[PDB]
Amino acid sequence: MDPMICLGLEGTAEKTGVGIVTSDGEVLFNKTIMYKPPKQGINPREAADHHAETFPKLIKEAFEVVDKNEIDLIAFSQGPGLGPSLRVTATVARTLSLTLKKPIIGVNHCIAHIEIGKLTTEAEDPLTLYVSGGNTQVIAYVSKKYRVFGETLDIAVGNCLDQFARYVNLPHPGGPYIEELARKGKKLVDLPYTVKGMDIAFSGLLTAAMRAYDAGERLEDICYSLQEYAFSMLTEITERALAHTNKGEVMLVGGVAANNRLREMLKAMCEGQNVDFYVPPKEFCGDNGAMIAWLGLLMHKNGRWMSLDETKIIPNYRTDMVEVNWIAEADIKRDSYLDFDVIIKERVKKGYRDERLDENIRKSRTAREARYLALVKDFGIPAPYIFDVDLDNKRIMMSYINGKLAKDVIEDNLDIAYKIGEIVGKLHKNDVIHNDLTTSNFIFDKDLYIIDFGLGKISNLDEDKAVDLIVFKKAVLSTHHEKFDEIWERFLEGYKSVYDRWEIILELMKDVERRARYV
């Protein structure tokens, strides 16, 4: 009876997975079967239907390998994920607990992906990029909790690819086909690169890929481009998260981790930053039951229970919500005369990306930034003065603001959350979207100074102003959790002072934020 053994169910998404694991970290059993969608016409089916048909076939096999009387705990994926899939998973898990007369534990699918990462790889405290069909977020364990530092703002990357494959009439799963076509591509088609803070968005990209297809661009080139852009965007936010959580290893996780290109771009990045890079073996990388079981053990082994009424599925289970109980883009230089001071900001090259992309990202952000830092004094917003610019070398000569970063003084002086709101309000009052609102991008002296503008854009759309505010919101929630409530409240106070339409877009935030799981 030494090794306590647990049976876990995975069913958050499109994969039916059953796992048996022992508290000693031994995987006695682990098989998963995927949903194969029927024609999207009439006579519809859903993954839930697949789970209902598949779970008991898998459980039979499991009981043929180990004695059901030997299993001591049953665990299941409580969320996040598809509601109808969660419910079949839960109902099957509950039936097992009741007839085996054994305890049951609901487990967070996301932090289960990473825990078997640690168990199954030489990682121990990684910044982990989790990508799949329904999920894409950057997670790290900080301050006693698993937290999101970067996530998609709309669809997951897996879904971006899946929809594109469908559009261009590739069979399911189309991922492998896009990855092969991309290898034969050579032109880097014009597509939108969309990073905002540490988050990203794939919708515009997907659409532009579609329009490029309609315009008669070579399928191979579109595929190559789709991948380069999406994967670069994902490598960038992981890079930013890395410099932000101060971790020394990165772990890639999820079905999309199967993509070699993504794996290699991600390894280059980690090699550049001298950090370790781990990927679990295929069978623990994509959705699987073993990870559910192992995390199940972790929490129960450390003493935590669940009444059948506590086993309600949580479609939007956030990583924050889980009680844990088992544990740079720009070189800046300062030049001085005996009284005058200048700083030069160089956007250095990123080896991991296609040099063509790298050239456009560095030049355009540099040009934008220069142009925007200038334009914004017209609105009464302190910023550095722009002395000169050298776009060939990706450099800016600007004035020097002596002071601490907002990120470093905001919690012990919440007033400066107000000033940030004032200058954002002034921004949106004037149609400028600053797509990187964080507390690392303002410097506080007497007034408050804005010091980044590389992702700027002119726009009168409310969706864009709304997203602007969510990126700020989300960033505050991850890096200033101890004081989040208050900083946002005062951020809105400042915003309200200046921009009279604040209410319209604040409400618009909600409808955009509901790019979550149904129910």
Cα angle: 402, vertex 403, 407; to 5 degrees: 145
What kind and span of H or E run contains 479? helix 462-479
Q: How far is the CB of 54 from Mg ion (least distance, A)?
A: 16
Cα 238 from chain centroid (whole Å): 8
Quick one: 77 or 238, whose CB is closer to Mg ion?
A: 77
| Total residues binding Mg ion (CB under 5 A) | 2
445 is in an annotated binding site: no
What is the spatial distance between Cα 60 and Cα 197, in angstroms, rounded to a whole number? 47
* 345 known member of a binding site: yes
The single residue of 72, 436, 452, 464 carrying the catalytic annotation is 436
Q: What DSSP designation does 171 have?
A: P
Q: How far is the CB of 287 from Mg ion (least distance, A)?
A: 4
Give the nearest distance from C-beta 81 to Mg ion in angstroms.
Answer: 8
Contact set for Mg ion, span 223-282 (CB under 5 A):
none
Burial class (CB in 10 A: 0-12, 13-18, 19+), 424: buried
Flag whether 79 is marked binding.
Answer: no
13's tokens: 């998404």
Nearest CA to 418 out of 323, 319, 489 is that of 489
The kind and range of the H/E element at 199 are: strand 199-200
Q: Beta strand pairing status for 249-253 and 127-131?
A: parallel
CB nearer Mg ion, residue 132 or residue 441: 132
Any binding-site annotation on 478?
Answer: no
Two structure tokens written together for 449: 């100074």
Active site residue 436: yes
Question: What are the structure tokens assigned to 149, written together?
Answer: 């530092």
Dist CA 183 CA 227 (whole Å): 10
Task: State the minimum distance, in angstroms, from the CB of residue 173 to Mg ion.
Answer: 15
Nearer to Mg ion, 93 or 191 (CB): 93
Does 10 appear as a known binding residue? no
- Helix, strand and coil content of the chain, in percent to the nearest 5, comes to 45, 20, 35
User: Which is nearer to Mg ion, 13 or 208 (by Cβ)?
Assistant: 13
Is 130 annotated for ligand binding? yes
Q: Is 172 annotated as belonging to a binding site? A: no
Q: Which of 74, 115, 103, 107 is nearest to 305 (CA)?
A: 103
Rg (CA), the chain: 24
* 436, 197 Cβ separation under 8 angstroms: yes
On whether the CB atoms of residues 111 and 322 are closer than 8 A, the answer is: yes
First to last CA, the chain: 41
| 292 is annotated as contributing to ligand binding | no
Instruction: Output 36 or 184, the one with its CB closest to Mg ion.
Output: 36
- Do residues 406 and 440 lie in contact, with contact meaning Cβ atoms separated by under 8 Å? yes
> What is the x/- site pattern for Mg ion, positions 122-161, by CB under 5 A?
----------x-----------------------------
Instruction: Decide: 343 and 335 in contact? Cβ < 8 Å.
Output: yes
Q: Is 199 in the site for Mg ion (CB under 5 A)?
A: no
| Under 8 Å between Cβ of 370 and 389 | yes
In the complex, the smallest distance separating the C-beta of residue 186 from Mg ion, rounded to whole angstroms, is: 33
Which one of the spans 168-176, 232-240, 285-293, 370-378 is the region binding Mg ion (CB under 5 A)? 285-293
> Rounded to the nearest whole angstrom, what is the least distance from the CB of residue 113 to Mg ion in the complex?
5
Rounded to whole angstroms, the Cα distance separating 489 from 485 reads 6
Please identify which residue in 154, 179, 199, 287 interacts with Mg ion, judged by CB under 5 A. 287
* Single-letter residue type at 330: A
| DSSP letter assigned to residue 105 | E
- 328 is known to lie in a ligand binding site: yes
Residues 74, 79: Cα–Cα separation, whole Å: 16
C-beta of 132 vs 232, nearer to Mg ion: 132
Q: Does the annotation flag 221 for ligand binding?
A: no
Give the integer Cα–Cα distance in Å for 450 and 387.
16
Asked if residue 287 belongs to a known ligand binding site, the reply is: yes
CB of 254 to Mg ion, least distance (A): 6
C-alpha–C-alpha distance, residues 362 and 344, integer Å: 15
What residues does 30 pair with on adjacent strands? 19
Does 175 show up as a binding residue in the annotation? yes
Residue 77 vs 366, nearer CB to Mg ion: 77
Provide the minimum distance between the beta carbon of 175 and Mg ion in the complex, in angstroms, as a whole number. Answer: 15
Q: Is 333 exposed, middle or buried (0-12, 13-18, 19+ CB in 10 A)?
A: exposed
Cβ 8 to Mg ion, closest distance in Å?
13
In whole angstroms, give the CA distance from residue 160 to residue 27.
33
Nearer CB in complex with Mg ion: 127/156? 156
Residue closer to Mg ion by CB (options 391, 516) is: 516
The annotated binding site is made up of 109, 113, 130-134, 162, 175, 179, 259, 287, 328-332, 345
- Residues with catalytic function: 436
The annotated binding site for Fe cation is made up of 109, 113, 130, 287
Which chain residues interact with Mg ion by CB under 5 A?
132, 287
The annotated binding site for ATP is made up of 328-332, 345
The annotated binding site for L-threonylcarbamoyladenylate is made up of 130-134, 162, 175, 179, 259
